[model samples]
Target: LTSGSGVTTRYWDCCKPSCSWGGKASVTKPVRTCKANGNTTIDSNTQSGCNGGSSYVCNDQQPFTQGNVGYGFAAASISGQPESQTCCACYEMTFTNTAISGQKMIVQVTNTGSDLNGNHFDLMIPGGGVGIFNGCQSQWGAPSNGWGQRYGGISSQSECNQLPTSLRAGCNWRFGWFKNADNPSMKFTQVRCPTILTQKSQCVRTPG
Candidate 1:
């Protein structure tokens, strides 16, 4: 349950100011709700072969590791690769559609009961889907400039469209992020993914 390869998943100091978990947390308890689907248009991730056609539901917390969560999966691509797809870290946040059916979900990072700025809160959904966390920011891709926006900023589609090709027909699109946000020196605050995604020391699993 630890990283020994000199890789460490540090949480935000600001987040732990009031929550039960410290700022250095991986996954967070469900806070807000957001929706996505095919045809969700994002300025970022558009050029990198993102399936902007289907809307998806996702959480807003960035997993230290790509495949940390049960359905969550991350990759090695932080930036674009010439031969392969840019390795963007990904995660799959499972939520009950029954919880927030009547209202738009709010995915945000608040006080973790330890720090001034809540440490972790960014979600990534392949193509278009739901972001479980509060803040949903767009990610960078191979062909387009990275768009920097906080989660909850991206709007849901007016209507769900046909599921994009990247997403499996029945299997919902899991959430993902640029990763590399677990830096110890960045203080105790969480900043949305930058245009140039940084490198993460290690990936950690969140406690259920």
Candidate 2:
């Protein structure tokens, strides 16, 4: 692993949240809040007359609408990163590491809204340019293909038992968010960067 490289810092894709309102009808109190580092939170309490309400069904992703006119909110941020500086309200959490590609990072996601389901955001890879997960969206509330499998820590002892030994140890990888993956009105924190193998690990996606 190396620190200095021609591609030391690359502008990849944007990681946006997926989620919507919860109450089906405009209620007296409708909002959802998340509790993350530094007590970060994102609330969705827009009222468009009685026509726009939230959903109450568990795990039901219902879009907010006003007389059949649906509307969605922009992705919110909980980490005070450059990507979430404008057009968004995020937590002021910062990280320091030799961020490398293909390593496993633990991102903490919180649901602090009062009237919306927990937010969901895609962690786009280097190729996403301006979208999450490189373009691969979330499927059934999970990352598409090996994006989560490779990036997120391999849980499920059964699946962990099936991984190749070569990759079981550690490796560099890339990914993109699928268009159909972003859910509605979701937000949380997530760890993104290279995997930790040794004390002197080089935090870069490319190996030399």
Candidate 3:
């Protein structure tokens, strides 16, 4: 852990399947639809979306989306850090350790977790970054893959079929959890919000 004037090890946040849409089942899970489905004239249910709503379905990108490649949000635990200053601030996170070492991504603060402790921030990564969950499960103590099942934590075959065509293509996609494993959470540093996303600061904290 880097104990410098501006460094700390924050935990990762994989918006678990159960936690999606406040535990609601009806919310739509965004999917990557092919360009063919451009117009509303085509049946929305028939076409397949892939790569987290950024690519075609059944394409080279196996699991459909690239684990929060484009979508990201964070919640700061209300602790010593001023919650008032944290929310709505876009942060550039650069991973310093783990399989995703040296990777950097920008995230905006859109949510809050009362239970979060200290300067800890929870990151949202779709499908746990591609095959991270499956890769970790194949071996013992091989990175903290969490308890998510293959393909976005799909609970059972029946549930998989009920998903939309695009999401069903990657039926294995599901959210996961972590108990204990190697490289459970990556270490990272938070950069100041960039000018491009200055508008993100307009977000306001929800009333408790």
Candidate 4:
């Protein structure tokens, strides 16, 4: 069931690098394990997202079209309503904030968080960095104590550009520099997984 028009909510990014996901640092206080192709075959020993093979990298490497810029498929976290059934499902998020008017992004469900509730969906943008919250409390929301430190992901412009075109926007001063790392909830709708992405796994059959 898609929310009407738009929903007043919050948004988070999953671009932070972790040891399990081929990054150099380890995720402190790992809360959940990463899902692979919608399956919970792997444990949260390394990273905390879906995996393509030995790591938490997504199998679908195509870019998610969200506005003029195209965002690459990263990872995602959602509430337990769908349980782990929502994996591989793609979501089109349109940001309603005037500051970022006409902006949109897409995300794939590759993970689940115990802190997520209602319609909340945490997005993973490689090098996207720690969002509005410094710790889990802000990361998840209600019922969270907020643990962890400032997230460090992509630090160089060249590294950010290596990502999909849309993700490169985060490298500039406008995205993470002057703007608030946390994005307010925007209008979103569940859509079919792109052919490139669905080729790796079938999309979830959400209930009406």
- Which digits, one per residue and each the tens of the lDDT, describe model 4 over residues 41-106? 345454332121232333233234433643434343343344334455567777666565557666
When sorted by TM-score, best at the front, the candidate numbers are 4, 3, 1, 2
Deviation in angstroms for 170 in model 3?
12
Evaluate candidate 4 by giving its C-alpha RMSD to the native, one decimal: 10.6
lDDT of 3: 0.33
Candidate 3 vs candidate 4: which has greater lDDT? 4
Please report, in order, the local distance difference test score of every candidate based on alpha carbons.
0.22, 0.23, 0.33, 0.40
The sequence of per-residue lDDT tens digits that candidate 2 reaches over residues 1-208 is 1111111111111121222234322222222322211023334443211122221111111112233221112232323322212122212112222232222222211111112222223332222122223222221122343323433323333342333332221211221111112121221232232122111111111111
66-124 per-residue lDDT for model 1 (tens digits): 24322222211111221111112221123222222121111222221112232232223
Cα shift from native, residue 128, model 3 (Å): 5.6
Candidates in order, TM-scores: namely 0.21, 0.19, 0.37, 0.47
lDDT of 3 by residue, 1-208 (tens): 1111122222222221111112121112222122322212212233222212221221111222234432245554434544344545455555544445454445555445445444454443323322321222221122344333332332344554533343333334323222111232333345554433333222322331
Task: Score candidate 1 by TM-score against the native.
Answer: 0.21
lDDT of 1 at 102: 21
Worst 10 residues of 1 by lDDT: 1-10
Relative to the true structure, candidate 2 has a C-alpha RMSD (angstroms) of 19.1
List where candidate 4 sits over 4 angstroms from the true fold. Answer: 4-54, 58-69, 74-80, 130-149, 152-181, 199-208
Model 3: per-residue Cα lDDT at residue 88: 51
